[PDB]
Amino acid sequence: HKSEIAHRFNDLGEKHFKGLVLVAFSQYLQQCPFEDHVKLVNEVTEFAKKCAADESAENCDKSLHTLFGDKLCTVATLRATYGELADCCEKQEPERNECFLTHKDDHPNLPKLKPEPDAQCAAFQEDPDKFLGKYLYEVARRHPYFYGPELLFHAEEYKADFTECCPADDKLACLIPKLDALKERILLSSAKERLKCSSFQNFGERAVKAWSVARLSQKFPKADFAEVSKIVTDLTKVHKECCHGDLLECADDRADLAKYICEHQDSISGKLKACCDKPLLQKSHCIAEVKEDDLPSDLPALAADFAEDKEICKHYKDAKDVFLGTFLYEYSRRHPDYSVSLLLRIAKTYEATLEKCCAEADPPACYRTVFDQFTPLVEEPKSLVKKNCDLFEEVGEYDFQNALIVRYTKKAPQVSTPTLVEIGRTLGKVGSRCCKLPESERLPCSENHLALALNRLCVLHEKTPVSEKITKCCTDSLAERRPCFSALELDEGYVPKEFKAETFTFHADICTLPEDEKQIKKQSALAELVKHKPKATKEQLKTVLGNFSAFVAKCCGAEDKEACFAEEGPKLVASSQLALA
Ligand SMILES: C[C@@H]1C[C@H]2[C@@H]3CCC4=CC(=O)C=C[C@]4(C)[C@@]3(F)[C@@H](O)C[C@]2(C)[C@@]1(O)C(=O)CO
Numbered sequence: 001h002k003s004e005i006a007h008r009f010n011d012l013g014e015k016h017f018k019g020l021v022l023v024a025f026s027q028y029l030q031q032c033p034f035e036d037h038v039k040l041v042n043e044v045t046e047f048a049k050k051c052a053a054d055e056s057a058e059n060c061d062k063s064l065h066t067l068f069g070d071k072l073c074t075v076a077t078l079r080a081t082y083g084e085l086a087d088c089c090e091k092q093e094p095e096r097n098e099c100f101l102t103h104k105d106d107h108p109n110l111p112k113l114k115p116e117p118d119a120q121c122a123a124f125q126e127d128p129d130k131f132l133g134k135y136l137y138e139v140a141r142r143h144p145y146f147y148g149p150e151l152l153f154h155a156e157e158y159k160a161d162f163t164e165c166c167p168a169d170d171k172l173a174c175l176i177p178k179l180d181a182l183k184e185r186i187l188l189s190s191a192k193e194r195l196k197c198s199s200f201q202n203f204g205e206r207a208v209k210a211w212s213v214a215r216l217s218q219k220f221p222k223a224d225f226a227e228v229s230k231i232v233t234d235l236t237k238v239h240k241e242c243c244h245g246d247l248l249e250c251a252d253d254r255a256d257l258a259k260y261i262c263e264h265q266d267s268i269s270g271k272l273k274a275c276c277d278k279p280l281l282q283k284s285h286c287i288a289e290v291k292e293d294d295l296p297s298d299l300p301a302l303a304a305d306f307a308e309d310k311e312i313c314k315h316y317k318d319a320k321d322v323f324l325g326t327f328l329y330e331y332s333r334r335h336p337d338y339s340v341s342l343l344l345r346i347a348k349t350y351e352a353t354l355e356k357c358c359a360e361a362d363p364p365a366c367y368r369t370v371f372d373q374f375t376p377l378v379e380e381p382k383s384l385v386k387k388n389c390d391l392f393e394e395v396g397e398y399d400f401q402n403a404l405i406v407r408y409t410k411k412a413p414q415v416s417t418p419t420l421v422e423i424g425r426t427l428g429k430v431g432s433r434c435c436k437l438p439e440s441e442r443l444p445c446s447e448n449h450l451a452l453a454l455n456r457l458c459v460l461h462e463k464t465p466v467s468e469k470i471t472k473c474c475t476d477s478l479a480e481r482r483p484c485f486s487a488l489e490l491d492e493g494y495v496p497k498e499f500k501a502e503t504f505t506f507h508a509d510i511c512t513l514p515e516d517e518k519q520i521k522k523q524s525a526l527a528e529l530v531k532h533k534p535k536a537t538k539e540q541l542k543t544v545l546g547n548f549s550a551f552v553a554k555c556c557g558a559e560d561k562e563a564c565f566a567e568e569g570p571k572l573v574a575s576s577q578l579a580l581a
């Protein structure tokens with residue numbers, strides 16, 4: 001109470017306290033060296049130990065924001081590396097942290113970590129605390145809004161992988177599959193949390209509560225409304241704190257919520273038992289990623305209370321938010337086969353009916369057939385997910401990505417090529433993950449992951465706005481975000497980008513790139529072909545990229561690579577224009 005840092009240190013323990021502060025500094029200061037950050041963590045850990053022993057000691061009565069924010073401004077390489085970030089230090093709290101958070105880089109362009117099993121299993125023994133410590137540093141700086149306590153968990157997933165594989169003869173065959181899967185889990189985790197932080201920023205905590213009521217109601221249909229409301233309230237406060245960089249307060253409140261859920265597990269979900277017999281980080285993660293519980297047999301029809309009841313306006317008038325919260329809980333728990341956006345869309349439609357009906361002469365007659373408005377809202381995304389999986393299953397991942405790059409480049413040609421390539425590549429991998437699932441699990445998978453990919457586009461677009469359409473879709477409404485983007489079409493009055501030959505000129509440098517980086521260069525060229533020829537068919541673009549593809553493979557196989565590229569390049573560049581007419 002007297003000393004907050006004393007409280008956090010005592011509650012969290014040294015390793016996790018240090019760990020979260022290393023992650024904290026790594027997110028705020030993303031280009032600072034590892035060894036520099038290690039000292040800053042030690043200097044804070046040092047001071048926290050003094051306060052826990054004697055809370056009356058100087059500076060111990062200050063808030064963690066102040067104490068952390070003060071330590072950030074004493075960084076010697078602050079003005080040199082980060083520039084404008086040093087201007088924030090002149091401002092006072094709470095405006096100083098708000099200033100720091102804006103200067104977090106969502107796209108830091110950092111070296112793509114190669115999994116080198118010979119180098120790392122050896123480095124795991126050379127300096128182990130440096131190893132697991134550096135892993136936290138590297139993930140944190142590439143993902144400045146990554147869920148702090150969730151990153152500590154991934155570091156222990158990292159630890160366990162090396163201790164299991166390094167002993168074995170073939171270190172590569174064991175480690176690579178395990179590490180490859182972890183990179184996929186980290187990108188998804190980063191994406192999930194960024195949408196929580198984005199929702200706070202753009203739509204406030206009411207939007208974050210609504211989303212969570214829907215998701216946890218699906219996860220815990222056995223749980224009553226007062227439990228879901230309690231868990232949502234506590235969990236919203238947790239994500240608010242983490243998203244504002246208060247990782248220590250975030251981590252402590254998260255541990256309290258883990259304890260609560262597990263002390264009341266029988267009346268929340270039968271699927272939590274395994275989770276609650278685990279250490280804090282394993283327990284917390286297991287709760288967050290818990291599979292949905294079996295549906296209760298004893299639930300009545302919704303219409304009885306939400307269409308038929310004659311005192312619905314009375315319920316609505318006195319307690320607007322609570323009664324809508326009640327509707328979302330009841331609709332969500334029955335429909336785990338629905339996306340969270342679809343549930344929030346339905347709930348927004350219900351509110352809209354009551355605002356208009358309780359004003360009219362005969363309200364009961366008005367909101368009698370409110371459930372008829374939902375059937376078309378359900379069918380639209382069902383139709384979209386079918387067409388995309390039908391396309392994916394036919395043409396496979398790479399060609400599905402290319403089809404989506406063309407789709408989104410036409411929707412927004414003003415958006416930077418790297419941004420368009422990223423969402424096309426992301427949404428293609430969603431095809432791989434989601435389409436191989438049963439129909440009931442497929443819609444939520446696709447549309448939930450789509451929301452994460454659209455948020456990424458909105459985050460990158462917010463930093464550097466180019467389109468008013470994209471701004472409107474990104475800022476209007478979170479529930480209506482997917483519909484808004486789905487509706488986007490090629491601007492009739494779009495001025496084609498003028499032809500630059502250098503943009504479509506390849507060299508021998510491409511041959512030495514890893515396959516992923518090789519595809520990005522070709523997929524970057526595809527986006528540019530669309531920007532130059534926006535009225536070209538997807539089938540014309542598929543063919544021209546196939547020629548570029550064949551041209552690269554040929555010259556990268558040639559005895560004289562640079563000689564091949566010099567001769568063949570301009571010929572293909574010239575014919576490609578005529579082909580896209
Ligand atoms: C869970 C409840 C119910 C929520 C509402 C459910 C219906 C709805 C759907 C939307 O697409 C946008 C806003 C609303 C209309 C809503 F999401 C927000 O207003 C926030 C809300 C009241 C809530 O989140 C609270 O804040 C409760 O106090």
Ligand SMILES: CCCCCCCCCCCCCC(=O)O
Nearest residue numbers: 192195196199207208211448451
């Ligand atoms: C509106 C987005 C719907 C689908 C998102 C599913 C993936 C999980 C991300 C969690 C982010 C929650 C968003 C929020 O805080 O409102």
